[PDB]
Design a protein around this nucleic acid. Structure first.
Ligand SMILES: Cc1cc2nc3c(=O)[nH]c(=O)nc-3n(C[C@H](O)[C@H](O)[C@H](O)COP(=O)(O)OP(=O)(O)OC[C@H]3O[C@@H](n4cnc5c(N)ncnc54)[C@H](O)[C@@H]3O)c2cc1C
Length: 455
DNA sequence: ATCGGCTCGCGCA
DNA sequence: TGCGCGAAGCCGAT
């Protein structure tokens, strides 16, 4: 807990007490891959300044990439190529390790005689597993910093929040303390495996790319990765799209969303930065309220969900009323039953669902509104709730650029299990889970135009 | 003990 | 297209 005027100590918490070593401060970067507006890197620099040592950044590439597609890999890697150059300009060296973070981070601390270890915060299961391994294998102090949420996850609330309307008041009460400008990253005054080689080695490791009847389906030109690109996407949203957001956010025929989720997922841009700029923008107040609710309440309540429910991707995490309902309807005759392969290919009877899948396959980002429709029909046309959850998670994390994310698990849990929702009218197969229909969409936007844009 | 109020479909201007 | 009601279980403020 070092000094600093803009260094709120509540953003940091110790994972391991220990004797501070004589070597550099190491920032094990995982979730927040950026140089600007990064509380984890800023704290690491602050601690370094106080101990008269340099700060270095270390990043561990795991074999997880093999589970989810070329498209996520290129986006991350191309971003990291930009990050390395950015950190070089500030005289901050970056090291890239390939292996199990459990093993590799421990050995790096020992070999480079690191004095203090800092990492960013993720509520996902696997990160806590790596952390506990690292703890068992080091002697130096080990700090965690929430660089992803405006209000630190463990400060916003101490329990799983049942609904946004109970969480909203708590989060906004803490905004005045935690919504603050970022100080500039001070360069080092003391002073890696080829990212280009990791790019090729693993891009060839993926022969199972999604193709077409043999042309590849992914279109990489829709989102340019990196920290610079993210800033441009933010500024064009404020300039051109924020004003209309309140009205057109749920019309998938209009590209009127922020398009920030891919950059937000990999932490190439801070949501605190986005919030700071949106707050100062003079736009329609209704649109502001709507957007802020999405990127503050719903984004950060998703971290709450995963942090306090370690089964966040299972039926157990559903609330009792949803479990009772879905259990009661397990034997109901489904009108249609499709396999993972058939959903994946877009071979259902519903042209709207198929179009949603085609947008996902081709762009890597399904519109917000149809994601709800998409997930809920998987529940409707699967043989069991467990199978639906599997299929939804599999397709989401495999094809969404912003997948493998708390927002994904919390969003699928809303669609299928009523997490952060309430009970609705009793139906068959879906019980009391909120229903969405083809006819409903027909009333809210030009379904025909969405279908034709994606075959 | 007890209400009020929560991010759909539907009928109607 | 925008509005007001319905159906439905529970949290938290009173
Ligand atoms: C079944 C399902 C799966 C989803 N999967 C993901 C996912 O894998 N990754 C992901 O980042 N989001 C997911 N979401 C939430 C939402 O769909 C996306 O965040 C949103 O579409 C991202 O596009 P955008 O930022 O251009 O939209 P915007 O309207 O510009 O929203 C801006 C930001 O607010 C946040 N946000 C918006 N909606 C939600 C939400 N429902 N929950 C949490 N945060 C939200 C996002 O951080 C988003 O980037 C999912 C929702 C559902 C219903």
């Amino acid at each position: 807990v070092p000094r600093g005027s803009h260094m709120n100590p509540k953003r940091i918490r110790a994972l391991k007490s220990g004797k501070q070593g004589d070597g550099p401060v190491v920032y094990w970067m995982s979730r927040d891959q950026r140089a600007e507006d990064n509380w984890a890197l800023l704290f690491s620099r602050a601690i370094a300044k106080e101990a008269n040592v340099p700060v270095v950044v270390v990043f561990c590439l795991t074999d997880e990439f093999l589970e989810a597609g070329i498209r996520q890999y290129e986006f991350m890697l191309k971003g990291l190529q930009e990050l390395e150059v950015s950190l070089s300009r500030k005289k901050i060296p970056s090291f890239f390790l390939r292996g199990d973070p459990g093993e590799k981070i421990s050995r790096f601390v020992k070999d480079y005689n690191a004095g203090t270890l800092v990492t960013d915060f993720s509520p996902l299961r696997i990160k806590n597993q790596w952390i506990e391994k690292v703890i068992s294998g080091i002697s130096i102090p080990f700090f965690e910093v929430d660089a992803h949420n405006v209000v630190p996850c463990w400060e916003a609330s101490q329990k799983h929040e049942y609904a946004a309307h109970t969480f909203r008041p708590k989060l906004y009460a803490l905004l005045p303390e935690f919504l603050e400008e970022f100080p500039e990253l001070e360069p080092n005054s003391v002073t890696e495996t080829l990212s280009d080689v990791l790019e090729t080695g693993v891009k060839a490791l993926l022969p199972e790319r999604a193709l077409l009847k043999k042309d590849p389906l992914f279109e990489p030109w829709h989102f340019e990765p990196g920290e610079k690109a993210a800033k441009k996407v933010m500024e064009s949203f404020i300039a051109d799209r924020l004003d209309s957001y309140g009205a057109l956010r749920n019309d998938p025929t209009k590209n009127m969303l922020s398009n920030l989720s891919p950059y937000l997922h990999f932490g190439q841009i801070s949501s605190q930065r986005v919030v700071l700029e949106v707050e100062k923008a003079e736009s329609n107040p209704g649109s502001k309220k709507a957007f802020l609710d999405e990127i503050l309440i719903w984004k950060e309540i998703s971290d709450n969900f995963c942090y306090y429910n370690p089964g966040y991707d299972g039926f157990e995490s559903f609330p009792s009323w949803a479990k009772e309902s879905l259990n009661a309807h397990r034997n109901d005759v489904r009108s249609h039953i499709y396999t993972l392969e058939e959903f994946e290919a877009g071979k259902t009877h519903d042209p709207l669902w198929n179009a949603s899948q085609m947008e996902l396959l081709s762009t890597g980002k399904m519109h917000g509104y149809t994601r709800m429709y998409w997930a809920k029909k998987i529940l409707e046309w699967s043989e069991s709730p467990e199978k639906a959850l599997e299929i939804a998670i599999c397709l989401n994390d495999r094809y969404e650029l912003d997948g493998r994310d708390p927002n994904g698990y919390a969003g699928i849990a809303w669609s299928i299990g009523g997490v952060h929702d309430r009970a609705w009218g009793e139906r068959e197969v879906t019980g009391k889970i909120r229903y969405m229909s083809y006819e409903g969409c027909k009333r809210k936007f030009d379904v025909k135009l969405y279908i034709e844009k994606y075959s």
